[PDB]
Amino acid sequence: PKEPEQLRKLFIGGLSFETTDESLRSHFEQWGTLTDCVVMRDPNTKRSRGFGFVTYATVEEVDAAMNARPHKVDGRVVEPKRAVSREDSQRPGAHLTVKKIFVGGIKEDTEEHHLRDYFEQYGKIEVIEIMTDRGSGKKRGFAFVTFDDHDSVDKIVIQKYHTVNGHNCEVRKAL
Numbered sequence: 001p002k003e004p005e006q007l008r009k010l011f012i013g014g015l016s017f018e019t020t021d022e023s024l025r026s027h028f029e030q031w032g033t034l035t036d037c038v039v040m041r042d043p044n045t046k047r048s049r050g051f052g053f054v055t056y057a058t059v060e061e062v063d064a065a066m067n068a069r070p071h072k073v074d075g076r077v078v079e080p081k082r083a084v085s086r087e088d089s090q091r092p093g094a095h096l097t098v099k100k101i102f103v104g105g106i107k108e109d110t111e112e113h114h115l116r117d118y119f120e121q122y123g124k125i126e127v128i129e130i131m132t133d134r135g136s137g138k139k140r141g142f143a144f145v146t147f148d149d150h151d152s153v154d155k156i157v158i159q160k161y162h163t164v165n166g167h168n169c170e171v172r173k174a175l
């Protein structure tokens, strides 16, 4: 039962113009089986457009490749990002590259360690902000988590569900 291809693809920006389908493949095959690997080129000149994409056989292989950043490919540090799987209707096909999530539906009994214990397995956490009422100090039932890197957030928002402290949470990219 293969994972959807869109969830196995990595857009690679910042390519050296000398990178080819073949050299990009030789690099990224170190972290998994590549079912697809293509450098974007101009249709007339064949000059590289400076980016491309690779598709792994599994999501765990995508994880392995992201955990092996920074990637220096043909002498240049590149910028891999997971494919846009849920677009912003106003900015079709654009990656919203942020390090912060909104976490809603945690009610008043969810504390910092609940969120840390869960989200630390997606990435390195820098800030956890449990929101409280400006007048009363009561918890408002949502929080923001800031990570040191965008891929944590990308992994988080492509999941269908997040269960934290027994709550079914709503999670989205923030700011």
Ligand SMILES: CC(=O)Nc1cc(C)[nH]n1
Binding pocket: 082, 083, 084, 085, 086, 087, 088, 094, 095, 096, 097, 154, 155, 157, 158
């Ligand atoms: C707007 C935006 O960044 N959407 C995304 C990103 C990923 C990995 N899935 N969906």
